[PDB]
Each structure stands twice: as C-alpha cells, then as structure tokens.
Scaffold this motif. Structure first.
Motif, PDB file in Angstrom:
ATOM      1  N   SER A  38       0.740  -1.190  -0.085  1.00  0.00           N
ATOM      2  CA  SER A  38      -0.009  -0.040   0.122  1.00  0.00           C
ATOM      3  C   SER A  38       0.911   1.251  -0.087  1.00  0.00           C
ATOM      4  O   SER A  38       1.672   1.501   0.940  1.00  0.00           O
ATOM      5  CB  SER A  38      -0.823  -0.070   1.148  1.00  0.00           C
ATOM      6  N   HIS A  39       0.806   2.013  -1.025  1.00  0.00           N
ATOM      7  CA  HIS A  39       1.530   3.384  -1.272  1.00  0.00           C
ATOM      8  C   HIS A  39       0.645   4.535  -1.350  1.00  0.00           C
ATOM      9  O   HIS A  39       0.569   5.086  -2.357  1.00  0.00           O
ATOM     10  CB  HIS A  39       2.485   3.086  -2.451  1.00  0.00           C
ATOM     11  N   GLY A  40       0.463   4.872  -0.097  1.00  0.00           N
ATOM     12  CA  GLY A  40      -0.358   6.287   0.263  1.00  0.00           C
ATOM     13  C   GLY A  40      -1.743   5.884   0.526  1.00  0.00           C
ATOM     14  O   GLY A  40      -1.813   5.111   1.272  1.00  0.00           O
ATOM     15  N   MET A  41      -2.508   7.117   0.465  1.00  0.00           N
ATOM     16  CA  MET A  41      -3.979   6.830   0.871  1.00  0.00           C
ATOM     17  C   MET A  41      -4.825   7.780   0.519  1.00  0.00           C
ATOM     18  O   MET A  41      -4.524   9.095  -0.005  1.00  0.00           O
ATOM     19  CB  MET A  41      -4.025   6.888   2.611  1.00  0.00           C
ATOM     20  N   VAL A  42      -6.211   7.379   0.308  1.00  0.00           N
ATOM     21  CA  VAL A  42      -7.028   8.237  -0.182  1.00  0.00           C
ATOM     22  C   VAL A  42      -7.868   8.969   0.721  1.00  0.00           C
ATOM     23  O   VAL A  42      -8.313   8.472   1.602  1.00  0.00           O
ATOM     24  CB  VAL A  42      -8.343   7.460  -0.915  1.00  0.00           C
ATOM     25  N   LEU A  43      -7.866  10.435   0.364  1.00  0.00           N
ATOM     26  CA  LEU A  43      -8.416  11.327   1.197  1.00  0.00           C
ATOM     27  C   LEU A  43      -9.803  11.255   1.561  1.00  0.00           C
ATOM     28  O   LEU A  43     -10.627  11.504   0.339  1.00  0.00           O
ATOM     29  CB  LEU A  43      -7.851  12.776   1.430  1.00  0.00           C
ATOM     30  N   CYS A  44     -10.808  11.128   2.535  1.00  0.00           N
ATOM     31  CA  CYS A  44     -12.009  11.038   2.639  1.00  0.00           C
ATOM     32  C   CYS A  44     -12.472  12.151   3.684  1.00  0.00           C
ATOM     33  O   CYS A  44     -11.808  12.755   4.551  1.00  0.00           O
ATOM     34  CB  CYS A  44     -12.641   9.696   2.948  1.00  0.00           C
ATOM     35  N   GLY A  45     -13.797  12.587   3.605  1.00  0.00           N
ATOM     36  CA  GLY A  45     -14.571  13.424   4.513  1.00  0.00           C
ATOM     37  C   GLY A  45     -15.526  12.561   5.323  1.00  0.00           C
ATOM     38  O   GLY A  45     -16.378  11.903   4.658  1.00  0.00           O
TER      39      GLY A  45
END
Length: 165
Positions: free
Chosen positions: A75-82
């Motif tokens: 896993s390389h990074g992350m998805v930004l959520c609200g």
C-alpha cells in the motif's frame, strides 16, 4: 510541522477495486496517479462503501507517504475522505482534472515543495498535526479556512461540516 506545503496531495483515477484477501475491511485499490504504473493503495471504506461506489472515480491521494505492506498486500499512499457521523465520502475534484496534478490551497506558493517522504513515525509526520485543521465546509474541502483548489475548481465533497482523514 503544521504546514500543508509539506504535503503532496495529487489527483488519481481508480482502475480497479479488489476485496482484500485476509483482512476484508480493506479495499485494495489500484490508482493511476500519473506515474509509470498505477499505485497500489489499501483503503478501509468497504464497511460503508461497496466496490462500485469507488471504481472509475477521481480521488485525492496523499502520495508522499512511506510505502507499507499491510497484511501481505502492499500500500503506497492513502485516499483522502471526509467523514460526518456514520457517513464517509470520497473527496472529489471537479471532473476533467488531469491525473497526477497537485492539489494546492488557496493563496499558497506552488514553488514550496512537499516532503520527498513523510515520516514512518506518526508523531513526527505533519499530516497528523494538520488533520485537525482539515475540515469540510458547505461541500468544500478546507485547511484552516483555506479552500483546496484543483486546476478546474474547488475540491468538492458530498457532505457538509465533515472532518477530513
């Protein structure tokens, strides 16, 4: 430490969403982020969203995170959520934005570069110092009163007054 200019937030497109083998809480996303091959990213949105709600959508990825190998898959990074209550939604750039482009704040210097890599240790990693100041307001994403701007407009979220993570 508290400084959004050290963060690399860039636009990605989701080519594949796959249920994780061992831990089913994670979605193994494959996200074209503009590089030579699409990044592998694991996001725990399976609990609230199903695979179709993610696929073929433009998302915002924090990209200058160190590489991890969670539960066997990488896993390389992350998805930004609200998030707001027991609802969680993807942050969405206006449609037609170029993949890989950097999301910058209002009135920030585009010459001020993000860190090459963020710290392995959470305490020294700015993002966790900055996250309290990341809020959604009236459907727009904010860092300390400042709107996130893409090349096509402000970063929208199908929520209001939500917290960003």
């Amino acid at each position: 430490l508290d400084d959004i200019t050290r963060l690399n937030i860039i636009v990605g497109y989701v080519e594949e969403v796959e249920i994780h083998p061992d831990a089913d809480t994670l979605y193994c996303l494959k996200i074209n982020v503009g590089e030579e091959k699409s990044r592998d990213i694991c996001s725990g949105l399976r609990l609230k969203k199903n695979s179709e709600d993610l696929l073929h959508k433009y998302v915002l990825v924090l990209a200058n995170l160190k590489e991890k190998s969670l539960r066997g898959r990488k896993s390389h990074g992350m998805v930004l959520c609200g998030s707001f209550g027991e609802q969680i939604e993807l942050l969405a750039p206006p449609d037609g934005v170029n993949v890989g482009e950097r999301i910058i704040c209002e009135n920030m210097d585009v010459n001020k570069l993000p860190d090459k890599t963020l710290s392995f240790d959470k305490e020294k990693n700015p993002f966790f110092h900055i996250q309290p100041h990341l809020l959604v307001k009236n459907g727009v994403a904010h860092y300390k009163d400042a709107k996130w701007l893409s090349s096509k407009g402000e970063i929208t979220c199908p929520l209001e007054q939500g917290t960003i993570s």
